Amino acid sequence: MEMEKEFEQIDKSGSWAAIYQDIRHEASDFPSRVAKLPKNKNRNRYRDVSPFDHSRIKLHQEDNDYINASLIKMEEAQRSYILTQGPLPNTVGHFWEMVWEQKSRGVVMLNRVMEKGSLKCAQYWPQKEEKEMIFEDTNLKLTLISEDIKSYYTVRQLELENLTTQETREILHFHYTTWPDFGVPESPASFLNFLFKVRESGSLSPEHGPVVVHCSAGIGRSGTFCLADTCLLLMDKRKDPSSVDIKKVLLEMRKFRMGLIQTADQLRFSYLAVIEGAKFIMGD
Numbered sequence: 356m357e358m359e360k361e362f363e364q365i366d367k368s369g370s371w372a373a374i375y376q377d378i379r380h381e382a383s384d385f386p387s388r389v390a391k392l393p394k395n396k397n398r399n400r401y402r403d404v405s406p407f408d409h410s411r412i413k414l415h416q417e418d419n420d421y422i423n424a425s426l427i428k429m430e431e432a433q434r435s436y437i438l439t440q441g442p443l444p445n446t447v448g449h450f451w452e453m454v455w456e457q458k459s460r461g462v463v464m465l466n467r468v469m470e471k472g473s474l475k476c477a478q479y480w481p482q483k484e485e486k487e488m489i490f491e492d493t494n495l496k497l498t499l500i501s502e503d504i505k506s507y508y509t510v511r512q513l514e515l516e517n518l519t520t521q522e523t524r525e526i527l528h529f530h531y532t533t534w535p536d537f538g539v540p541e542s543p544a545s546f547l548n549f550l551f552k553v554r555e556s557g558s559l560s561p562e563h564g565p566v567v568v569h570c571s572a573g574i575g576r577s578g579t580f581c582l583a584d585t586c587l588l589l590m591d592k593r594k595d596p597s598s599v600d601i602k603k604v605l606l607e608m609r610k611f612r613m614g615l616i617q618t619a620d621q622l623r624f625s626y627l628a629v630i631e632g633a634k635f636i637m638g639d
């Protein structure tokens with residue numbers, strides 16, 4: 356069923372809450388035993404948001420391999436994403452270790468450091484060229500190379516250096532800065548523009564490791580980003596795009612991380628983003 360028609364039918368009936376609860380009820384439940392070990396309590400931002408054991412990212416160290424991060428592998432779309440929480444003061448070194456070990460090219464950030472008067476994630480990247488950051492626990496150095504500030508997003512060039520081998524890589528930081536403190540954006544235009552900028556960079560492409568995507572918990576805004584990307588890509592892949600079922604794509608992604616899309620308003624916004632994905636694509 357063509358999604359703009361499914362969309363108008365749900366809107367006219369005001370049944371967003373009922374669709375959303377059906378998804379919550381059918382979503383996968385897998386064990387998260389490593390996340391709940393007492394040694395890992397200070398590595399988790401939220402007690403109710405954990406990575407599944409089967410899909411968790413492992414740090415390449417013998418001490419403690421744990422980070423709150425999941426590999427989302429979309430087989431038909433041929434895309435992979437790592438979804439993670441906003442780093443904590445004690446996990447900033449783990450975060451950059453993961454970026455290094457997984458060979459990621461891009462980091463996508465969908466939150467501000469402070470929202471609603473509280474801290475949503477650590478200041479994990481340098482704000483001035485001449486004041487670099489050293490992570491002594493993981494032996495990495497991070498330098499700001501350049502910054503491009505636009506109305507709805509900022510793009511940064513960073514240099515990550517493995518101090519053990521003296522190898523360096525360029526990491527692109529894509530920071531969406533205008534998601535509102537409450538609710539979802541009124542138009543998906545600036546979000547879609549942002550997604551197209553990440554794609555243009557090469558960050559989502561198979562010649563690199565998976566993109567790292569985060570918000571505060573790494574399930575809501577982060578879920579919307581990967582759901583919209585996978586949906587529009589599948590429209591160019593299939594002989595009939597009308598066959599792309601956003602609810603079925605979301606349940607597939609929820610096999611790899613719990614809780615993706617946190618509200619009925621985010622579900623509606625993700626439908627809207629994929630639907631309004633038409634404009635600045637096929638037709639006009």
Ligand SMILES: OC1CN(C(c2ccccc2)c2ccccc2)C1
Binds near residue numbers: 636
């Ligand atoms: O290269 C441009 C992307 N356009 C496709 C497209 C359509 C919807 C969403 C993503 C992409 C397309 C056009 C006409 C027939 C079937 C698909 C053509």
